[PDB]
Amino acid sequence: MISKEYHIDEEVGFALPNPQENLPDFYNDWMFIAKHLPDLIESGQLRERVEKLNMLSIDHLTDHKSQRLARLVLGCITMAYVWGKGHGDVRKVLPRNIAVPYCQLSKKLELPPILVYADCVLANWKKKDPNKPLTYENMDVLFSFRDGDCSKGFFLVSLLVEIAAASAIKVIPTVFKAMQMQERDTLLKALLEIASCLEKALQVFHQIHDHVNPKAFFSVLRIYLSGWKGNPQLSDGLVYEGFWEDPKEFAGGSAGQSSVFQCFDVLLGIQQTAGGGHAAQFLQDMRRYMPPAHRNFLCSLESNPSVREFVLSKGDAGLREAYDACVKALVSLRSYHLQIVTKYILIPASQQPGTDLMNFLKTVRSTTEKSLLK
Numbered sequence: 001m002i003s004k005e006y007h008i009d010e011e012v013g014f015a016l017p018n019p020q021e022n023l024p025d026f027y028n029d030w031m032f033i034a035k036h037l038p039d040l041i042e043s044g045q046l047r048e049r050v051e052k053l054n055m056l057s058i059d060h061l062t063d064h065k066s067q068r069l070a071r072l073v074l075g076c077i078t079m080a081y082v083w084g085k086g087h088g089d090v091r092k093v094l095p096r097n098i099a100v101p102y103c104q105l106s107k108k109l110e111l112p113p114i115l116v117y118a119d120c121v122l123a124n125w126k127k128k129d130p131n132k133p134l135t136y137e138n139m140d141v142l143f144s145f146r147d148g149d150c151s152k153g154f155f156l157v158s159l160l161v162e163i164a165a166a167s168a169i170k171v172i173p174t175v176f177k178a179m180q181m182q183e184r185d186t187l188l189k190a191l192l193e194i195a196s197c198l199e200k201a202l203q204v205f206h207q208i209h210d211h212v213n214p215k216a217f218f219s220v221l222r223i224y225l226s227g228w229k230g231n232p233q234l235s236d237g238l239v240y241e242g243f244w245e246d247p248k249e250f251a252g253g254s255a256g257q258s259s260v261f262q263c264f265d266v267l268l269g270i271q272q273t274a275g276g277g278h279a280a281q282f283l284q285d286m287r288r289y290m291p292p293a294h295r296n297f298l299c300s301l302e303s304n305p306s307v308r309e310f311v312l313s314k315g316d317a318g319l320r321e322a323y324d325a326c327v328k329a330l331v332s333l334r335s336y337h338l339q340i341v342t343k344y345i346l347i348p349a350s351q352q353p354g355t356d357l358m359n360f361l362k363t364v365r366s367t368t369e370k371s372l373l374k
């Protein structure tokens with residue numbers, strides 16, 4: 001079994017298990033804004049409301065789940081504040097009453113002060129009926145940006161794919177134990193189980209089409225997920241008033257921030273972070289946007305011996321076939337992600353009166369393809 005210091009759940013993997021819905025009474029003003037963002041943004045009172053807030057201390061957020069919920073709340077409020085209605089009217093300064101606690105909370109949890117995958121996917125969910133299981137139909141997001149933004153579809157299908165891949169994560173100890181104990185059959189069985197889980201996760205990914213519209217995603221939700229690293233809209237970055245004097249650059253939300261998105265490439269010796277190129281640079285940089293325990297987990301995978309070298313060293317077709325089943329499943333996940341970017345970003349952008357993500361993902365897939373053994 002995996003160590004508890006890495007904070008990986010048996011059921012939900014890297015996702016935050018049963019995350020908190022309500023902050024303590026001290027932070028009701030935060031929850032008031034975050035709960036009614038679709039109304040407050042559209043009616044144009046979001047920015048005024050945030051500007052009229054008091055600066056609240058973070059010290060009454062005691063346990064982890066409360067601190068994580070606050071990050072989700074504050075993060076969503078920040079993106080709403082920065083982008084507004086999402087028509088290129090941009091706030092270059094985040095006010096100190098929201099900025100100081102958000103940055104202090106961000107420092108405490110070891111994350112950048114900006115909405116990340118961990119917030120808006122891994123912590124942004126609840127069961128409807130606790131007695132019923134984890135499916136889209138028994139689930140809901142805590143927070144959304146606008147009405148008809150498809151944040152439920154986008155975030156929950158991402159979360160279900162995250163949870164699907166969790167079935168493989170618990171096999172990882174078996175993979176490393178088998179190698180040190182030279183248990184070839186156990187290793188073979190283990191790799192096949194990883195491939196089966198990654199095959200299943202692709203099927204779970206298909207739900208994206210059922211619950212997300214292309215035009216809605218591109219025009220509405222994409223803008224709210226955008227950050228301010230290399231963005232012309234905030235050239236110099238955002239100002240966190242009363243915390244840093246100069247503006248600071250931080251990247252927006254990305255599937256690259258998912259620990260699952262990276263960990264299997266690490267496990268299988270696919271050197272995605274090698275090359276010296278933009279893609280490798282990106283994947284490495286996004287480990288800082290993961291929770292500390294998860295970026296430590298990716299580190300300990302890298303520190304363990306190579307599964308690829310072990311398979312190659314044995315002159316074993318079955319082990320190679322099983323290894324390739326995992327590689328093949330990842331290739332299918334990259335290809336499918338590419339189909340999503342085409343449908344949800346490229347085509348809606350052409351209908352406007354994209355590419356860097358395609359090229360990024362094509363490199364990621366190409367590195368995965370070239371790691372096949374047969």
Ligand SMILES: O=C(Nc1ccc(F)cc1)C1(c2ccc(-c3nc4ccccc4[nH]3)cc2)COC1
Binds near residue numbers: 116155253
């Ligand atoms: O962009 C996504 N989500 C997202 C992005 C930003 C954000 F702030 C919040 C959510 C989508 C997505 C893309 C790739 C994966 C994925 N999981 C993998 C596991 C293993 C290997 C390859 C994987 N790709 C999962 C979800 C959901 O529509 C595309």
